[model samples]
Target: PRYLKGWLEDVVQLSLRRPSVHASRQRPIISLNERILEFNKSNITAIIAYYTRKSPSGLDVERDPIEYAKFMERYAVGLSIKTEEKYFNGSYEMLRKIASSVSIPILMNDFIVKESQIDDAYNLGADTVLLIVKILTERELESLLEYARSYGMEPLILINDENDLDIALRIGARFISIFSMNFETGEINKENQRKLISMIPSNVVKVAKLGISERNEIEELRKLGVNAFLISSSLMRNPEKIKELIE
Candidate 1:
């Protein structure tokens, strides 16, 4: 199953040897963490940092496979440990010393599909975690969410379309992310957004993700009850402008 595959590496790493995943000095040019905190303080509902994995896409395996894998493994482990340390240490030392300095509620955005991942998130000081409805069965979704709540972690499910939204509602996810535009076109699918939001329970928090680049669109979504917007490419492209736009 898709969910099972997602957990395999972490499970294997835990059982065999705990690999060290550390943060590399070559971090993103833009500071996602700072953007998140700033977004949160501005009264924006929530901000999620899509802390991506250093997979084949991010690595030049042909040139340096062994070194790259070692780097990635340590990097991943480091983030997991950092989150845990931040939780108990009460100091955002690891995440704070970086360029980005915003302080909002952050979702440790990743392809989370295992019990161990949830444990990692709580240990890492994540206020929220994302569970994509397209990736799990109803039972799997419900079970994982319950486990997350047990550890005092909030679960935000991502729903790509109407079917995803339906499953989210049935599974009792209180937050959702809507991806409603063509990646190439950069056009908005207002009809789909309106339909999905209308059907969702009022208490559910709707977050607009992907293809959202304009402030006008974000404000419009807010008007339609979307309290959170996951802005990545825009911020990454021009991080300095983030504060200005929000202001």
Candidate 2:
């Protein structure tokens, strides 16, 4: 497959592959359920990075996904490998490769318009799938949520505003992604993020992600009762930065 080969080719061209626990694999893998259990049990509290071709700015970058996966293996408490065809420019092969490349729980973040994609995620070894409430109808969202559940995969439903948040809360979705950044303008909406975090029930897994750069911000969010984070860019991308941060 050119797509798979192409992804590996990008890494090969950059000369950027590293050995890790995933590369070694001496034991059985951990399930995502146990991961969520452990997340609340430990200091680790973030799904670090949704690797994609384009940054939130709509500008482009040299996306070394293979290196990012290996990086995730080291520092990330969890991972979100978005597999969307159009906007994100991600591929299904990337998801499968990432599954083998890291031990952390994997999430497929996308505008999941069908049940087959959710089925595809489980079959490919993803622990969960991201569902954007903004894109799905009520029936479509619930059906997909239930469909994902049947395959033993949890759904991380995303809500951008009150309109979508109401639908998410109404459905009693366990995992909710509440963004803190305005991707369109590339600005940090910390106030909005904080507000969204406040609105979510304490039991619901709060994914407070957006323009998160350092440990101090994470600490602040934790104080506000954030369950976990969805960080990328500064936490991801560079091998040196990744190694430095995980230390």
Candidate 3:
């Protein structure tokens, strides 16, 4: 689990540098905020209020894995002592404030690699938490979701490809996050998304994440029966503009 913290930090650094490769492929960059607003305006079933946090410092990104481990060691100890006193507190407040402004269900998106993290989410007013299968063992994933359910908090497991579909079923997860949109190739992994969705029973709710910037992509994904969409960069650039698009 400690190794995972560094891996996530690396992924975040990469995401910040490139954002979404698929988003850049289009003629014009699509605003996530606008996409959400438009999706909601069209009366779409659900949307996620993705929180935007400050980028990691360059020094943190450049550190070697060993050095990164040391940083995380300090981070974990500090987190344990502070509990909801710092970033977690601020993040929850922001999530609650934004969720209060929206009518649809809100899925709190974060690097939730620890059980303690879920408590922060619940206390912050999150209806659902995004859990990535790529980062956890099958048993750990199932146990975490069960705990979340016990607390009345929903878990939306994110799958990179079809293999994750089987895991989702085994965990009896009700919601899913399709991650074809986050690739560095700047193309929607439509084939992968379709394959994963095909395996999903009709009763399950699927949400599209990453790579979505244009209206057509959203429309097509909607047609494919994706119940929710998570847009971050597109909304962060111009929150008001995206809000209008939603309207």
Candidate 4:
């Protein structure tokens, strides 16, 4: 996403100074990073997402969303339950059904453009919500953050570009994520991911998203100081490989 490539920044807390929005970072639970540090010394952590059988549109088509989540959590530090309507082929019930079955924090990985969505997130049992920085205005970003906080939910900042990084700062986001899949093109490059990883700060929970495969891949990102990740696809399809990936 960065034209220059190789950029990264600090460790701090984000708070809203407005008449609304609280002063605390709104993350009283063991944060995504804190939980990651628990897994490995270099602080390697994976937010594992699993897909239920869907009928080409949305929602699961078969049984036991709980079992599916439990299976993924066997080696995962966090949970990413997909709930998009059209593209990802999911619905909020996915998160709702699986949340209680797991012990780790669950992140609702979606566009999350509106404040009402945060309410849906919590009601459906998400500890955190994925907010795409490029998709929102500053006011909207702040509004969502404050709204998400009202329900004891933290916002995970998801950025795809430098402009998104600017919004992340303006909105005082304490956690940020970079997805490896390009939004426009259907391209996925493991190499370009390092470009996104470099620009992240230590304070914000920098979550690397998508296209991560094998142990060495994560090892390289850890070398670049990326401790958190949102991993799906490969594992969702072949969860048996988690022993090698997470161990």
- Highest lDDT: give the candidate number: 2
Model 4: ten consecutive residues of lowest lDDT: 9-18
What is the full ranking by TM-score, best candidate first?
A: 2, 4, 3, 1
Give the worst 10-residue stretch by lDDT in candidate 2: 15-24
Tell me, what's the RMSD of every candidate?
10.2, 8.8, 13.5, 8.8
Model 1 per-residue lDDT tens digits across residues 80-173: 1122221122123333332122223345555556676665555544555677676677887898889977866557787767887887888787
Clashes of 2: 0
Tens-digit per-residue lDDT, 188-211, candidate 3: 576777777677787776777536
Q: How many angstroms is residue 2 displaced in model 3 relative to the true structure, after the best TM-score fit?
A: 9.4
List the pairs of residues colliding in candidate 2.
Answer: none
Highest TM-score against the true fold, candidate: 2
| Candidate 1 vs candidate 3, lDDT winner | 3
Model 4 RMSD in angstroms: 8.8
Q: Candidate 1: which stretches are off by over 4 Å?
A: 2-103, 181-190
Considering lDDT, where higher is better, how would the candidates rank from best to worst?
A: 2, 4, 3, 1
What TM-score quantifies how close candidate 3 is to the native fold? 0.63
| lDDT tens per residue, model 4, 1-247 | 1111111100000011101211222223334445666665654456555464442223334535677678866777777776765445566666666766676777777666665566666666677888766556678788888887677666888777777777787778877777656644535566666776676666776777656466777777767877666665546556667677665
| Model 4 misplacement above 4 A | 1-33, 40-47, 52-64, 189-192
TM-score of each: 0.61, 0.79, 0.63, 0.76
